[PDB]
Every structure is written in structure tokens, then in C-alpha cells.
């Protein structure tokens, strides 16, 4: 029996929680490290077993013991307390590069060489190409583009919201080209470069994937991976949502690398050229292909946010024809990375009003906010205060909840203020960081019960202990989609649905675009 808390810390200024299982309001304080009371308040229930005790009013940073009934906490206030966690969250993307040396200066104890440096196949054919650089998506070495979308667009939105506070935060500078940029934008490149060798000149569509044609043993190093690299057919999701994050990238980029800008803006339209000439042909792996298929039956929110994005960078009213039929579908407006529609919402409610209907925006604008409420009442009657269910709690449900936490705080860039915005961001910080039924904080490197062993065959197959640090872990799942977790985990509520073992995929792996929202979210709060 124990506290549950935020593990990292708490802003200053910022909203203060702890939890524990009750069954009635017990007092609590919290005392400078050497004695002396500062702050006391009583529990309060908030459903099931659960009492919180706020201590927002708390504004003097420290180190504090938090003391309620027999249990004792250490709980931390400081101006700035996620810049750190921030910056290993970013930094993960350099630890994910495939490629290029990662020296010790920059890596410490998890530096390597450059890895997959040979060509990859066009599957069926005696082809060779070079799809060089970019990150490892997950736990295993395969570069996929639809899932690749919305870790790029992730960061060149933090780029865009929160610059100031992502300025104070440094990734791995000696392994990106000079001039250095913004942190954002200098991790994203390497992605974006990828990126845009995987558009066949031929044609303009986009390779799905790049992977060996299966995965190698958890205990592999990225560097000894010899298995032959093969690149998955066209395919019009990795097309669309290639083009959707170049065209965005052609925008974010023009003040910084305009060489770069110009040519996504070019790769982009060549993609949207693709789309037109082609079948919405759901994606399906080859024979002898068993890596990651990122498949996905619906394809029009891709081709929304495709659209969307070309509205957004050329700014010519013309693409909005195409746009608000699309719009006005019944697509889920969500942030990845099968179902994409809400990044087309804010490409199209963020594009100049000169070239949209004003009455199409405020009906978006109208959806937008109404579907804010449903996720609104959602953390309203959840203890822990997240917009989640428990049948919510799937394969990556951090990653759910953050893109939730996510999509309050892109609406406020779009006049879209919705009241709960800030008080849902902290909350899911707050579970991520262990404020949840496991106690457990889903990143590793941070709190006092960090993540130990990811899914993660550098982690697992270098010799160090401790993991990559920075790394968010998909959390708990109810579906039970591995060997280890349906062994130790049926029956169990769907929040406790999570195992910190290696071979736990499920619940335990990381990717790049479950850190992706989380840097979003993250630097959203830091910029207090
Ligand atoms: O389709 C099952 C789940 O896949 C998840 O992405 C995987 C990917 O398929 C693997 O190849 C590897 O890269 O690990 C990833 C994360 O565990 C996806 O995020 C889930 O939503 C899917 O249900
Ligand atoms: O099905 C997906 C999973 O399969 C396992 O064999 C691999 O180790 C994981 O990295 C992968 O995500
Ligand atoms: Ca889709
Ligand atoms: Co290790
Ligand atoms: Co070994
Ligand atoms: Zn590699």
C-alpha cells in the first residue's frame, strides 16, 4: 500500500496531485526534506478507491516529504521540472538513428555504430536502393513511412506551439549537420531525409516499409544485423500520409533549410499526384515479409490530411474543394497513426480564412469542440482525471492518452479554448509519470519506479543494465497480445494490464511515435 504520484516532479506554478487507496478523507502534509510542515490539506474521493490530496497552492520549489495516514513520499517542485525528461524524450530519436555512428560523447553507455548501411531490395525485383537514415521505430529495426508521418508531424508541431520551451533542451548536436537548428527540427530532418528516399522517382508513390524480411532475436544489436534489407510495395497510406508530412515540413522548414523546404514542397505534390492516379488499396504484407504491416482498411482520413496539408502550404483556395467534402465525413478525429483525420483539421483550420468557407470552419471548429466535451466528460469521471475508458486501454494506450491530451491543446492554437485543456495535460503527465494503479512511471530513466526492461533490442542486446533512457513504453493492454502478458495478466483491471518484461510487446515496447505526442504534451506543460 502506497502513494501514487507524479514521479518526475511538479511545475511551480503548475497543478499539484497525489493518490492513494482510501476509504475515507485523511489529513496529509508535506514537510521541507529536514522537518519543518509547509502545506496541509485533506484526501477527497474520486471514485472507486480512490482519494487525491491537491497541493497546487504549494509554490515554493524543494524536495518535499509527503506524508499521509503511516506512508511517506518524496515529491519534487522545481521552475522547470520536466526539461530533463523532455530531453531524453527527444533524444530518443537520436538513439533510434539508423545509420550513423552514435559516439560516446553523445550516447554514453548506449553508443554504437552505424547500422543497416547496405541497400534494400524492391521487393520482387533485382532493384537496390539506398533508404539510409531516419529512426528505428520501435523495438525492432524496421523504417516504416505511415507510422514515420506522425512522429514528424508530432515534432514540427511542438516546433511550432511550444519553441520556447523545446529551445531549452539539446539532442544529440555532433551527430546533425551544421548549421544547427531549432532541437525539433534538427531531430526531425534526420527522419525527413529518410523520408525522401523512399518516393520512386518512377512514379511518386512511397514505399510502406524498409525492413528485413523478419525480425531478428531480441538479442540483436542494431550493428549486427546482417539480414538483407527489402522494401514493401507502394502503398497509397504511406503515399498520403508521406505527402502530408512533407508539405508540412515544406512550410516549417522554409525559414531554416529553404533547399530542403523546396523539395519536400515538390516530393509532396509528386505523392498527391500518385494518390490521384491510384486505388485506396489497403496495405497487406508481401510473401516472406513478416515485420510490422501498419495495415489499415480506411484510407480517407489519409487522403484528408494529405489534402489538408497541400491547402496549408500553397494556401491557394482552390485545394479547399477537395478538403470539405472530406471534412464532412464521419471519420475519427484522431491523431495516428491509422486514423489521421484530426492532423487534416488543424492543417485546414490553420490555413489563411481568405482561402476556406468560413461556415465549413466553424462547423470543423464546431465538431472540434464537441469532441473535446466527450473526452472532457470522460477525465471527469475517471479517478485519475485522463479522458480514458478502460476498453481505451489498448496496444499503446499511452499513446492514446497523449494524443488526447494532445488534441485539447492543438485546439487551443485554433481558438478552440476549451476549459479542461491544461488540467488534462497535467493529468496525463501525471500518469505517465506513475499517478496510475501500478504505481508505475512508463518511462524509462525517470522516477522512482521507472521502466527496466523494454522491449528494445538495443536495450536488451548491449551489455548496460539500464535502458535507452527516455524511452515512453506503450502501457497497459487489455487484449493480452503476447505470450507474457496473457500468463501473468488475465484478469486483471485494463489499467494494471502491463508487465515490465522484455518480451511483454504489448504493453512494454517503444516507438517513435508513442514519444512523439509525449514530447508535444510535454513541452506544452513546461511552457507553463
Ligand atoms: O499491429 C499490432 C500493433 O502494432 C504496433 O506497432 C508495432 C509494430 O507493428 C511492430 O513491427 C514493432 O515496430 O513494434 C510496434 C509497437 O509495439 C502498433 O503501435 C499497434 O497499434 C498495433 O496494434
Ligand atoms: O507482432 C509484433 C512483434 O513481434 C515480435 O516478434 C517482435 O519481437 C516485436 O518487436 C514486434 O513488435
Ligand atoms: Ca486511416
Ligand atoms: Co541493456
Ligand atoms: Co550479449
Ligand atoms: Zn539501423
Not at 485523511?26 to 482519494?51: C, D, S
Not at 539506398?130 to 507510422?147: E, F, I, L, R, S
Not at 526531425?188 to 520512386?200: F, G, K, N, P, V
Request: aromatic share 10%.
Amino acid at each position: 500500500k502506497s502513494i501514487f504520484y507524479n514521479q518526475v516532479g511538479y511545475l511551480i506554478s503548475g497543478d499539484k496531485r497525489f493518490w492513494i487507496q482510501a476509504h475515507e478523507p485523511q489529513p496529509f502534509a508535506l514537510r521541507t526534506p529536514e522537518g519543518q510542515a509547509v502545506f496541509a490539506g485533506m484526501t477527497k474521493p474520486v471514485g472507486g478507491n480512490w482519494y487525491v490530496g491537491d497541493f497546487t497552492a504549494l509554490r515554493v520549489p524543494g524536495t518535499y516529504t509527503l506524508t499521509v495516514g503511516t506512508l511517506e513520499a518524496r515529491v519534487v517542485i522545481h521552475r522547470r521540472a520536466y526539461r530533463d525528461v523532455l530531453e531524453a524524450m527527444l533524444r530518443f530519436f537520436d538513439y533510434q538513428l539508423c545509420g550513423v555512428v552514435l559516439p560516446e560523447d553523445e550516447a554514453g553507455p548506449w553508443a554504437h555504430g552505424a547500422c543497416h548501411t547496405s541497400d534494400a531490395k524492391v521487393f520482387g525485383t533485382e532493384r537496390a536502393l539506398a533508404c539510409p537514415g531516419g529512426w528505428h521505430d520501435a523495438g525492432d529495426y524496421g523504417k516504416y513511412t505511415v507510422p514515420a508521418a506522425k512522429a514528424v508531424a508530432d515534432l514540427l508541431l511542438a516546433h511550432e506551439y511550444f519553441p520556447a520551451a523545446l529551445a531549452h533542451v539539446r539532442p544529440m548536436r555532433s551527430v546533425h549537420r551544421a548549421p544547427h537548428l531549432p532541437p525539433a527540427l534538427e531531430v526531425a530532418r534526420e527522419e525527413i531525409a529518410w523520408l525522401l528516399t523512399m518516393q520512386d522517382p518512377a512514379t511518386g508513390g512511397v514505399y510502406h516499409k524498409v525492413t528485413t524480411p523478419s525480425f531478428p532475436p531480441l538479442d540483436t544489436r542494431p550493428e549486427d544485423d546482417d539480414a538483407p534489407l527489402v522494401l514493401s510495395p507502394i502503398s497509397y497510406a504511406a503515399t498520403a500520409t508521406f505527402c502530408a508530412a512533407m508539405a508540412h515540413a515544406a512550410l516549417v522548414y522554409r525559414p531554416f533549410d529553404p533547399a530542403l523546404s523546396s523539395c519536400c514542397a515538390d516530393a509532396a505534390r509528386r505523392a498527391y499526384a500518385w494518390l490521384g492516379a491510384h486505388e485506396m488499396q489497403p496495405f497487406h504484407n508481401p510473401d516472406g515479409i513478416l515485420t510490422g504491416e501498419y495495415g489499415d482498411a480506411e484510407l480517407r482520413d489519409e487522403l484528408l490530411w494529405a489534402s489538408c496539408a497541400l491547402l496549408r502550404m500553397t494556401g491557394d483556395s482552390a485545394w479547399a474543394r477537395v478538403c470539405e467534402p472530406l471534412l464532412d465525413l464521419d471519420l475519427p478525429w484522431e491523431l495516428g497513426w491509422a486514423d489521421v483525420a484530426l492532423y487534416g483539421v488543424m492543417d485546414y483550420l490553420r490555413t489563411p480564412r481568405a482561402a476556406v468557407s468560413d461556415d465549413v470552419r466553424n462547423k470543423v471548429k464546431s465538431r472540434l469542440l464537441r469532441e473535446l466535451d466527450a473526452l472532457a466528460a470522460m477525465a471527469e469521471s475517471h479517478p485519475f482525471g485522463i479522458p480514458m475508458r478502460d476498453d481505451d486501454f489498448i496496444w499503446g494506450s499511452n499513446m492514446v492518452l497523449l494524443n488526447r491530451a494532445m488534441a485539447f491543446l492543438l485546439a487551443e492554437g485554433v481558438g478552440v479554448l476549451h476549459p479542461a485543456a491544461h488540467t488534462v495535460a497535467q493529468r496525463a503527465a501525471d500518469y505517465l509519470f506513475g499517478a496510475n494503479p501500478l504505481g508505475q512511471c512508463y518511462v524509462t530513466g525517470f522516477g522512482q519506479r521507472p521502466v527496466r526492461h523494454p522491449h528494445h533490442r538495443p536495450s536488451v542486446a548491449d551489455d548496460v543494465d539500464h535502458p535507452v533512457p527516455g524511452m515512453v513504453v506503450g502501457g497497459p493492454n487489455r487484449h493480452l497480445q503476447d505470450e507474457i502478458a496473457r500468463a501473468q495478466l488475465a484478469g486483471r483491471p485494463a489499467m494494471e494490464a502491463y508487465i515490465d518484461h522484455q518480451d511483454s510487446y504489448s504493453t512494454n515496447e517503444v516507438a517513435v511515435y508513442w514519444n512523439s505526442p509525449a514530447v508535444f504534451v510535454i513541452a506544452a506543460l513546461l511552457e507553463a
